[PDB]
Structures are given as structure tokens and as C-alpha cells.
Amino acid sequence: MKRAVITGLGIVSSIGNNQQEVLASLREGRSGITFSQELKDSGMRSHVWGNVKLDTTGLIDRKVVRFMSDASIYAFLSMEQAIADAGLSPEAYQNNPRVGLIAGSGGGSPRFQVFGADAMRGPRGLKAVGPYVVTKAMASGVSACLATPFKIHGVNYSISSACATSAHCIGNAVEQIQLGKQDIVFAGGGEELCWEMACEFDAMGALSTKYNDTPEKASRTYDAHRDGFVIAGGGGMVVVEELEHALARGAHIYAEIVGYGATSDGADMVAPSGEGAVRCMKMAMHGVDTPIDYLNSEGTSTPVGDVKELAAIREVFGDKSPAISATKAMTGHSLGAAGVQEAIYSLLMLEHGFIAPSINIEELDEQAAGLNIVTETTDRELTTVMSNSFGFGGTNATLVMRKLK
Amino acid sequence: MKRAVITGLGIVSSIGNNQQEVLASLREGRSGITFSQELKDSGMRSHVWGNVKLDTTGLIDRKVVRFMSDASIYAFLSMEQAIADAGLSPEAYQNNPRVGLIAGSGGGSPRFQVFGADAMRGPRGLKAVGPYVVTKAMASGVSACLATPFKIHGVNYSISSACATSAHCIGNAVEQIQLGKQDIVFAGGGEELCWEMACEFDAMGALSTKYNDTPEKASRTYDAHRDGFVIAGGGGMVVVEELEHALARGAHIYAEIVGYGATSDGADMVAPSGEGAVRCMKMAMHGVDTPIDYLNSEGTSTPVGDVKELAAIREVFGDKSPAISATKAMTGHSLGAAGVQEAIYSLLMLEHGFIAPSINIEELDEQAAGLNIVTETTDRELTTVMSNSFGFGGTNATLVMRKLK
Numbered sequence A, B: 001m002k003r004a005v006i007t008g009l010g011i012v013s014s015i016g017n018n019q020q021e022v023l024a025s026l027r028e029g030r031s032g033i034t035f036s037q038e039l040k041d042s043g044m045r046s047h048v049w050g051n052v053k054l055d056t057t058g059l060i061d062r063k064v065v066r067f068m069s070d071a072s073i074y075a076f077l078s079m080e081q082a083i084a085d086a087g088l089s090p091e092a093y094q095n096n097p098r099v100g101l102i103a104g105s106g107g108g109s110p111r112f113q114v115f116g117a118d119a120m121r122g123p124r125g126l127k128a129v130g131p132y133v134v135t136k137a138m139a140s141g142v143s144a145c146l147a148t149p150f151k152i153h154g155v156n157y158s159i160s161s162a163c164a165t166s167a168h169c170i171g172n173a174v175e176q177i178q179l180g181k182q183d184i185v186f187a188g189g190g191e192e193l194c195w196e197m198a199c200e201f202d203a204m205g206a207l208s209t210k211y212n213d214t215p216e217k218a219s220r221t222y223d224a225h226r227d228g229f230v231i232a233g234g235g236g237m238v239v240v241e242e243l244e245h246a247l248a249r250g251a252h253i254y255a256e257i258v259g260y261g262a263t264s265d266g267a268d269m270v271a272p273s274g275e276g277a278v279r280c281m282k283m284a285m286h287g288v289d290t291p292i293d294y295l296n297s298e299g300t301s302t303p304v305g306d307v308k309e310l311a312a313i314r315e316v317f318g319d320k321s322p323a324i325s326a327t328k329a330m331t332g333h334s335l336g337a338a339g340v341q342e343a344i345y346s347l348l349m350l351e352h353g354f355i356a357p358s359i360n361i362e363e364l365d366e367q368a369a370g371l372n373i374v375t376e377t378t379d380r381e382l383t384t385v386m387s388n389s390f391g392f393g394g395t396n397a398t399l400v401m402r403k404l405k
């Protein structure tokens, strides 16, 4: 029913402005978290975040970047990398009805929305707002701002599902390939980092605040002393392609997506049920004859969420649990981008034969009884990896990637 | 392959709070547009809007509504209606893995993003923000605030695509059914109506500003003196159900979704290319052996967009021009909620045998010289109908619905 593989990837995150710098952080277990004067100044309780250490000035043409917000900028630079890394040229993916793009952001653009309102409420009104805000503020800014400049002609929309946003874009891209509708679909997303949005999460008490003095130690998934997640920003993009088409062009193939799970909890608004995650991982694992060697969990670094996922994993596997690591302990939570960025970390691990360490665990949580929680970079021969993404609204996404035959 | 049908629908729009109210408005060409003091006081040049005439206070459990924004409220009340109209009992759709939800909004909640920022900058800081701003402001709010209370266990996420949003949610739900992954998928969308989001359209010059004195005359698609669209809010939801599942339970079936097109322009950020729309409609018409009796056009009432759509239609049908009307002339533009609301108008026209009028056409633009644009309510036995939805970012969606035997 048509198979789907990844033929290229691109990424911009708190731990790397490309897959090279990223692979390096993953191996040394480098933290992307830094104290942020912006957050502390806004009056927040959280003073840390996984910021992108990149000066994007001049990296994008003036007539293009003028419609974009940081989530569009981070996803656009990621799409440039994935295109090159996929070995694709304009002639092959542009003005091609069979090449699409499905990417989005978890929160559109709080920053430009507040800028519009603030500017509008000033003496210059509409003239201060300017004619470029709609595209920066709209929820589909990440897919709109890339499909136009990259001249995409197939599918063009953004899936939004909070923290599982970019995992669903990929899953949806696969279904496009499976349905025989598209030969290639660029899938992923981005997310800006600003107080405007982070203050909403702190007001909800979901961001760690007891470690503003040891930033690199704030995100500490599965540690009995975790107190919430560290907000992060960035972008990511993967080239999802139909198998025959990619073998035909002699493309590099990182892996085949043999599993995609999308489920709903129908329970709580801001906390996972666990019952949903269980069914979600199982749906993804359905059909996959190879065991899951590694699992990049959601591991948000929150008291409730972490404990829930652990029980869920123990329910799906039990004793025969795969290696597990919460890359968020070092990268933070890029919210909408977390899905694609974590699918990439999973691919790099599968590609280079290793397992990133779950860092900052000065004391494991009782809820992680018989689970293989890797806490040190371990060289292993991976064949089948799994990534879990959970978001508010009890929305769940699970992806299973396996090395080709 | 599996077939998808519509078995229930629900709606809250500027022209009606339920299908009956709306049917009557369409039948009689009644405008849902009014003068807005809120837009005039904000400093905007456009002072007209398609507002929902309904105080929603108390129609939703306080426990639930505390997490919602106006886009979620409109879509949630639409769903209650759809569930009832489809004759679905709670045990029939609740906690059911084969029942999902796909519904989004175009901008989430500009109002609440700004609230968080205005609050955070005040003397109360975080204490004034509150722990409910997140689910209100996020892009997936519409799907999260509905999936949870209705105990949805299947698919759960939003699709954002500016003005094509809910149309893509519908197409996606069909895809879920064609892939055999779900039996029912509530598809739809919601949009809030506020100056925060509106001024942004006005600073772009996309809103009508010359008819503030004569509100119901502002929205005039295909009229030589049109000058932009009238912003509007509201919500809509339809029940997409697998054909065998619907017939088995003796469900009332409005029509089958026989065609679905999703395409990209890869040209201009805010103006339609026309070329992408031509492909979008031909894609949706693939395999459909019956002619299109009525076309509910995008018809935003804009100088450029109205022209481009008429050109696309000309190319698609040639001399076999079907009946055409732009319901937006009387409803305004509900952005993210437009796709599901206009499919519903179309369904009601197909269900009751009539063609709503394209009002306000005092002087037919030259571009439409050779077309069958209906300006007076005309009774007629329709069988197959199409509805176009185009949005910024060059995103395109087309739905073709057909009566069943």
C-alpha cells in the first residue's frame, strides 16, 4: 500500500544549528539550556529556555523573510538543510503537483500577535501594524511561509496538535504517500521562543522554576526532583518519500516509517491519561515484526506527565522494555517542533548506531521500576526506533522508524 | 476503497444558530452582517462584521468552558448539534478508538494571546494571567477543547490552512475513513471575532471599508464595486462516517463526499495564483462521473481573488459552467470556520433542492460576463455540488458532495 522512507533531514535547535552540531551534542550529552534575561525580565518564575544560538540575519532573502515569524524562519532554514541533505534540486521538487509540504507550529506567533495589538493600540494604528502581520500571526504561518518560496505545488497545510504538532505532520505526510497522492512531502515544523508565550505556561505552573541557577540541570526528566519542563524554540524538517521513487533516484535513505500512531485520551485537558499513550504506541507497533531497540520518549520533565508515560511504557512492553532516554533533559521542549526534532534525534541515533543519554537524573523515579533507562551515551546497533509525542487536549502521536532491508 | 458520507451537521454562524435558522437565511438571501462599534473604537477603517448573534454564557459546563476560547465555543456547540442530528448516542461515539475528531481554526485566539501579554505586563503579573490561557491561545484549541469533553479516543488534532482550514479538516477525515483507520470523524472548525485579529486584516487592506454606513451591502462578491471581505466568526461541524457504518445503523445520510482536492500555488503569499485553484478542482473532480450542478465559490469579495477564482472556474468547466453563488456575500468570511460552514450551506442546498442567491450584485464585474451566477433563490433538483476554499500561503481545498440513491 506504498511505503514511506526519510531521504533527508534538516534541523535548528538549542543543541545544534544542523545535524552535525546536533549529533555532537547528543553524543557528549550537551545541554542546550541557558539562563534567559528576557524571561526573568518579563517577570516570570522560570528563567531558563533552550534558545537557538544562531544569528539568522541575512540567511533569508528580504522579500521572503518579511512575511515570517521565528517559527517560519526556524522551519525554513531546516527545509533548506533537508533539501540539500536529500540531494534534491529545484527541477525535481518545484512546481511539481506530486510534492507537498505539511508543517506547523504549536502556537502560531504570540509575539507578532501581541505586536499587532500593541501597535494597533498606539497613535499610528494600522500604519504601525503594517501589512505583514497576518502571515506571521496565523496558525498556518509555518506551512504558508515555506510552500510559497519553495514553489510547492502538492498538499499545503499545517497540522496543529500542541506538543505533538510536528509528529502528526510527519504521520500525515506518510498517509499522503500511502494513499498514492504524493511522491514527496516535506514534513515537520517550528516554534518561536518568547516571553509572550512562555509566560502562559509559567502561569499554569508547567515550567521548572527551582533551577534558575543551574540551567543545564533544570530539565531533569525522570528525576525525583523534576519540577516542570524548560521551554524551547527551534525548527525541523524531514523529507518523507515514496520508496520506489527514492530507490529510483539513488537517494540516501535513513529509515522507513513502518509505524504511525495517532490517538486521543478523551480525559484531561492538560495532563496525559496514559490509557491513550498505550493504545497510540500499540497502533504504531502494529505490523512491525522487529522489536523496538530504542525509544525516544516524550519525557517532558514534569511530575505527572513523566510518571504517566512510564506506566504506559511498562504497560506496552513490561519487562522486555527497550532502551529509553528523554532527549528533552538536554534540549528542552520545543513544543510544536519537539515532534520532528525528536524524530531526527531518533534517526541520527539509528544512523550512527548510538543512544543518547538521559541526563540530569540524580535520583531515578520509583515509577521507572523495570525500564531500560539509558543514562550514558551507549554505542549500539539500532534497527527499529520509536518516538512518543503527547500534547494538551490529550492528543497523542507515535512514530516507528526502521532501517531499510 | 472505503466510501465516506455526511450523516449529521451542526452550525453557529452570522446567519443562524442551527441548520433551520441558516436554511431560512439562505432561502431568503438574508445578510448576517452588522455594524461593529468594537471595530470602530479599535481604530480600524472596516466597521462591519459577520457576528454570531448568541450569548453563549452557560451553554457549556463551566468546568469545560474555562479552557475554551470563542473559536472552541462555536465549534463545540456545532458538534453537540451534529451529534444529535446524526442520531449518535454517547456510547456510540464516546471512548471509541474508531471515532475521531479533526477540526481547527485559522488563528487560534489572538484575543487571549494578547490577554496573557497585557496581564503579564500589569501589577498582577502571572497571577492575572491564569492557568487557562494556554489551551485558549494555542493553534489546536479547537480540537483539544472538544476531543477531551466528548471523550474522543480516535484521531485528535487540528489542521490550519488559513481560509481553507475546516475544508482541509473535512478532506482529512475522509482520508482517515478511506484508509480504514476510523468509522466516524467529526470534522469542522471555529473562529473567534475580535478586533485583535481583525485589525491585522485591515492593516493589510483586505477588509471592506467603504460601506460602513450600509453594513449588509459591504460584502458584494462579483460586484464591480467590491472592496474587500467582511470578517466573521462562528463555527461548524459535520459527521464524516464510513458508508457501511452509516447504512448499517440506519443513519440519515446527507451526501457522499465523492471528491476532495488539496493543492498549493507556490506563487504569492496573499494573492491566489488561480493555477493552483484550477488543479485543486480538477483533482476533486477526478473519478466523478456526474456533472456539478452548483458551485459554492470562495468569493471572498476581493478585487483580485474574485477575478482569479472566476478565471479558474472558466478553465475547469469551459462552456459547461455550473450554477454559481457566493454565500459569503451574505455571511462574511469566517476564515477558519468557512470551509465547514460553506459545505453545510451546500449540503442544505442539496438536501432541500435550492440555490441560495449571490446577493449584492448591483453591477456584474466584466470578468463574469459569461457565467451562470445565481442572484435570486432558485428551486432546483441538485445532485452533485462543489465548494471552493482558498487561503493565504497559496493553500487550496475543494469538496464535491453528491446525493446518494
Ligand SMILES: [N+]
Residues within 6 Å of the ligand: A296, A297, A298, A342, A343, A387, A388, A389
Ligand atoms: N520523543
Ligand SMILES: [N+]
Residues within 6 Å of the ligand: B296, B297, B298, B342, B387, B388, B389
Ligand atoms: N465555498
